[PDB]
Amino acid sequence: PIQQLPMMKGMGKDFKNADYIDYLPVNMLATPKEILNSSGYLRSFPGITKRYDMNGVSRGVEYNTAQNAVYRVCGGKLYKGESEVGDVAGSGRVSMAHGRTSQAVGVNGQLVEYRYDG
Amino acid sequence: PIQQLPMMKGMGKDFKNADYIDYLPVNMLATPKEILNSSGYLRSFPGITKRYDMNGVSRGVEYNTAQNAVYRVCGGKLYKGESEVGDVAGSGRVSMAHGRTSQAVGVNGQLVEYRYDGTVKTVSNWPADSGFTQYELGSVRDITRLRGRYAWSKDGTDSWFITDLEDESHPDRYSAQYRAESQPDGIIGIGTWRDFIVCFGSSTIEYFSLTGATTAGAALYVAQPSLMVQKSIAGTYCKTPFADSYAFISHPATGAPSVYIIGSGQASPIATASIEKIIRSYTAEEMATGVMETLRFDSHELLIIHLPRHVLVYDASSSQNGPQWCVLKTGLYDDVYRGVDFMYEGNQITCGDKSEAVVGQLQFDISSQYDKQQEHLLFTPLFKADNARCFDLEVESSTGVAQYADRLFLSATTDGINYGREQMIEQNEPFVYDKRVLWKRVGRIRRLIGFKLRVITKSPVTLSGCQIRLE
Amino acid sequence: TDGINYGREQMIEQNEPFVYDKRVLWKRVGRIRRLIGFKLRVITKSPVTLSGCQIRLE
Amino acid sequence: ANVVVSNPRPIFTESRSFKAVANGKIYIGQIDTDPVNPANQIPVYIENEDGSHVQITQPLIINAAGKIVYNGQLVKIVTVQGHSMAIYDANGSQVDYIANVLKYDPDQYSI
Amino acid sequence: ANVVVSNPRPIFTESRSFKAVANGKIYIGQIDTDPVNPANQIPVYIENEDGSHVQITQPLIINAAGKIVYNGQLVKIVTVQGHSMAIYDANGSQVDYIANVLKYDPDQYSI
Amino acid sequence: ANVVVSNPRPIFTESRSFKAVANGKIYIGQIDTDPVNPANQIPVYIENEDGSHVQITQPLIINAAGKIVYNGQLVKIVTVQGHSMAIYDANGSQVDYIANVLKYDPDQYSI
Amino acid sequence: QIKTKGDLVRAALRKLGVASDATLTDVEPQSMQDAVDDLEAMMAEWYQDGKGIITGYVFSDDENPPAEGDDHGLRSSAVSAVFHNLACRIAPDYALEATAKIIATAKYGKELLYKQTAISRAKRAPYPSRMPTGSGNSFANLNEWHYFPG
Amino acid sequence: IKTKGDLVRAALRKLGVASDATLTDVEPQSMQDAVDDLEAMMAEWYQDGKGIITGYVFSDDENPPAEGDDHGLRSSAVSAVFHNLACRIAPDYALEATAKIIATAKYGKELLYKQTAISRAKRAPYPSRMPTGSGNSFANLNEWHYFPG
Amino acid sequence: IKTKGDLVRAALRKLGVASDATLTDVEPQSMQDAVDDLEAMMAEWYQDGKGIITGYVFSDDENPPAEGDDHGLRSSAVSAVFHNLACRIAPDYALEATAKIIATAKYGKELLYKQTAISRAKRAPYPSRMPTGSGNSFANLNEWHYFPG
């Protein structure tokens, strides 16, 4: 009796609460594709390779539509792409909202605009 | 146990990423017709024959409704049908927007109008002494026409203009400046849907409609937020009408690019995983230069995409069981399809050429392109059979129109990446209409097997339901 | 067997460098007494693509 | 060391057994195509000892020892450029098919 | 003119008898080095019909006709230029330890 | 990934049938001459794996598999000028003959 | 024809239909070697030195490591029996079982193999040590009288 | 009819594998395969002369391009031989020959061996110890007891 | 062929558990355990010398790393031995050996015991009470009644 076993979501108990809980797949991405004898195949998450160095940990990302390049705020420098294009203070996560004439990053309770001319 | 094998979409691994990918049919068009014992038959793409010559490679096509003839810009020379009806500069792809009093081709950043009486005029500001408003026209990127006005977008900016009603050369007298300012997105391309002037931004899509204002200085076009689509086009020419709407390729700003169709102010994907992986395999600049267009013949409603190293085709009528993509190609190896800028005129379709300075008309009784052989591929999906044997492997072929008794190379894999020995079987016989393509003694499927049907011929190949006697 | 803690860890080859037709097969799993749940744990630097899990519950 | 001894006249055998093709046929043709269509065919020449190249009737013949023969005597056949081979045994079954091959002649380096 | 039509799939026979080395093993490695060591092994490629190069495990197998056979059937193995060789028969003995195949070209004045 | 894996070691087989030339003889002579004559015999060196060229006696010996052999070991025979290979079977017969193997004498041409 | 132990093995696999030439999938040469080993074991079981079925088979040896290439040496008529045999033997290796036609042909082939040996090994035993030659034989005058067996 | 190719094509027809009635053209690999099988079957039947004899000639398939051409088979044995060949090559394609083919093969083999069996019946001569009666000429010519063997 | 590992791998092949034709590599636990089963089967057959005898050698699996290496088994008995081992380890994996394997095992066991049975047939000596006839030399040498036992 050949019986198939799903793996897209595993089950099990919880030794503290004694409740049935879902044992979730780890570092896997179920893909609904008709594979061989089953309806889907589990695929490992893509790996990470270092593109280049940066100052400090990452705090935000925003794809600037105006300049067609990504502005990433790591540590205390507002890196655009790979080149540093400003000084940002603080250490917590910061939210950005790109604009046509200025790229801004709300930090330390004040909305700071980094104009495109410097 | 006679078991059928689909061929509308072949499946297999990818030796670099180790991921399962769709092995797409090559130079084939699945046709959902109840054929014999199968629900559809694979049909070879129509061949290309040289109708007449042209100057340079093809750069654009547009069916001029006003003159009821097709205007085609090849190389550095503008052509109307057979004749030469003006000189066009530049070398890259050009966008045209035909008009009732002038045929125009936005080239080299300027909208050039080729008037129907022979003269040529270019868009420029009104004379200073005239007294009308002066604008900053800049460089023209994409053009369109709607209700007697030419709409073009300033390059590198989200502003677009409209020409005057009386004198079409200059922009509108008082109100000719309009912006797609809902987001800080530059306009990558412009177009006309129904009575709306779309504006494909780098991150958004806006719809504009006439307000009917009469007083001077009032904005003729007002934005229609309710129809906004929160996606974008990858490049200037990654859009085209398709099924009473525009399909496109998503700009990388919103995420990984993927072929989309606009519906009721919403983008619905029509690209499978393999298609969008192929699209993502390209760099930003290479994928920006891609151009996509619509071709309709028989029952198929194609959406041809001209990528730099691939030519993906979406067959709308054959998407009953899911999206159906076929990769067209020219030559024996992986060269890119030569045919470009398809347009249906008069009786038969005509298409330009990417490499040579010629124009080809699609011919349905042959598959050769400019009197050359072409390769047609068909892959069956991988299926798990353990310790089984397969003997009868029959594919129904419509035989007879061929020139020589061309043969197909039939091979089977075991791991889904590399294939085994190529077995040669006659597939067409010239002017014999009841040949069967039958192969016996296929062998034993150890773990997996996948059959690749490869046909090298100058005549159409029509393969139908594939039966394998997995005994 | 109870869904919380697991038994012996059996090591089976999952990839082989540059071999495309290996099968990950384990025989003689044993007797399912009341309940059973299998945990597949892979430690690797290369992508792992696991497909439909077949068990011959005889 | 200037010249190493090596046997010319390459030997052709079957694909699953070591016995040699006997009175089979070798067909030469364009890259990745059917080398039976005269449209797909490529000219092949005979390179005699004197070096005088001469064209040959297309379907190559194999003796009982898996070696090309023309007019009885063994010959060395040379193609103009890359080619695809489809080796048929005596009956007409294909021994094997290959789409792209290339082996430049080691001789005539003086030319 | 400058390409020979030859045996496309190579024949690996045994040294002590005129028989193909069934289930033999060939390892390919760096010049003048033992190719059995996995570190010494160099990339080895198959050239399928699509023109792709898919790399396979180094212990290439030899069928009962002397050719190189993958998991399935005949393939066109491809290496770079400087491939060493080491035929091992299934029993585990040695047949060849060709160190520099490039030094087996019939014309070494060219090199 | 340029060249195709191919056995470089030469195997000698009879012209009119598929058998090795067991205990055959190879005579390596001057250009355009009969190598059987002792006078028309050039010096033939063996080249070892390390590359230690050593001279040996002219009437080469072939083992039962076709490969050239010395002292029960496979060897590679090299010559410092172009030659005219002449293979004779054990019974005694001109199974093959080459006027000029390489078609140009490297020695003289080196100038 | 079938002249090598391999030719026997590959043609038996052909009779099963696994890898039969003109086939899109062929079995690894490892399995051909192992089936050659199986044929060798089956013939060793049959042959039993002098007593068992004598087909004229020649076994492999170390001077010829590739047992496949070795000439089996079977009689011309005997090739069909070992042909259709070893197909039933290899049948469970691939989990296939042998068709009834192959079973019947293998039985007939083994019977034909042993027919000549059975006819040649009748050899009615000589007279026992007690049976006397009658007065009819002139050798009774030579004092031989009683027969001498062994 | 008069060549091995015709016999093997008739056998393949009887299987229904390859025939004009089916619009299948015989595969050259199938041709060589079933011709080799016919060679093996005829050798097994002939049994180096002690078994059934039909007049079949074993080419050699060494000097010729292929063994299959011409056959010394008697005109009456063609049906039996090609039916038996069809039955023997049935499991090659995983087919099983229809019961009519099996019955025809049995009938044909029986008819082939009928004449040989009648010829081989013979009779052993009289035992060495059996004497001729007084009513013979060899009684006067001193022969008396019959010649042994 | 010439080692216990080869015999047990052949058995696993025939049972269909692990073979190259199946792209399965033998499990080391399966290796050890089926070798143990072969050892038990050989002990049972040998029966301390009174039963069937094959030339098999029982390693000891005390000083060696593992019992499975080399076997003194006669070349003719290998087929029977590995067929019987496959049949005996069939229920370990819940499989059942195909009827061909069972028939082959029966045939092989019969063949292995054939020669020992012929050798053991012998014949009992004459009963102690049976005398020589008057026509013997032992009649003069006073032997007369045959030697008992």
XYZ file of C-alpha atoms in Angstrom, chain A residues 20-91:
72
model
C -1.413 20.325 18.619
C 0.668 22.887 16.732
C 1.866 23.135 13.148
C 5.501 22.118 12.704
C 6.380 24.511 9.962
C 8.933 23.815 7.227
C 12.216 25.597 7.904
C 14.145 27.374 5.138
C 11.840 25.801 2.547
C 9.389 27.255 0.029
C 6.561 25.041 -1.202
C 6.027 25.474 -4.945
C 2.676 24.352 -6.417
C 4.050 22.608 -9.505
C 2.986 19.241 -10.895
C 6.145 17.256 -10.089
C 6.411 13.555 -10.933
C 3.750 11.853 -8.804
C 2.990 14.796 -6.481
C 1.398 18.224 -6.817
C 4.298 20.233 -5.378
C 7.969 20.230 -4.475
C 9.756 21.853 -1.547
C 12.545 24.250 -2.534
C 15.270 25.574 -0.253
C 15.490 29.305 0.317
C 18.111 31.016 -1.878
C 21.455 31.576 -0.224
C 23.118 34.885 0.569
C 26.505 35.972 -0.764
C 28.249 39.204 0.210
C 28.041 41.735 -2.615
C 30.081 44.422 -0.838
C 30.754 45.875 2.594
C 28.678 48.537 4.318
C 28.760 50.698 7.439
C 26.789 49.280 10.353
C 23.728 47.052 10.339
C 20.842 47.575 7.920
C 17.998 49.826 9.044
C 15.849 50.369 5.947
C 15.475 49.962 2.208
C 13.503 51.790 -0.474
C 13.622 51.537 -4.266
C 13.872 55.157 -5.391
C 11.716 55.317 -8.508
C 12.894 58.843 -9.356
C 16.585 57.941 -9.670
C 15.958 54.302 -10.694
C 18.310 53.062 -7.979
C 17.911 51.592 -4.508
C 18.634 53.728 -1.447
C 19.688 51.682 1.576
C 20.328 53.137 5.026
C 22.845 51.048 6.963
C 24.457 52.035 10.245
C 24.817 55.790 10.070
C 25.242 56.467 6.348
C 22.504 56.739 3.698
C 24.063 54.515 1.046
C 22.606 54.849 -2.447
C 23.484 51.690 -4.307
C 27.098 51.277 -3.212
C 28.270 54.900 -2.765
C 27.605 56.793 0.464
C 25.411 59.842 -0.152
C 24.818 61.309 3.287
C 25.051 61.186 7.072
C 22.089 59.825 9.055
C 21.897 59.789 12.852
C 20.234 57.344 15.232
C 20.370 53.575 15.558
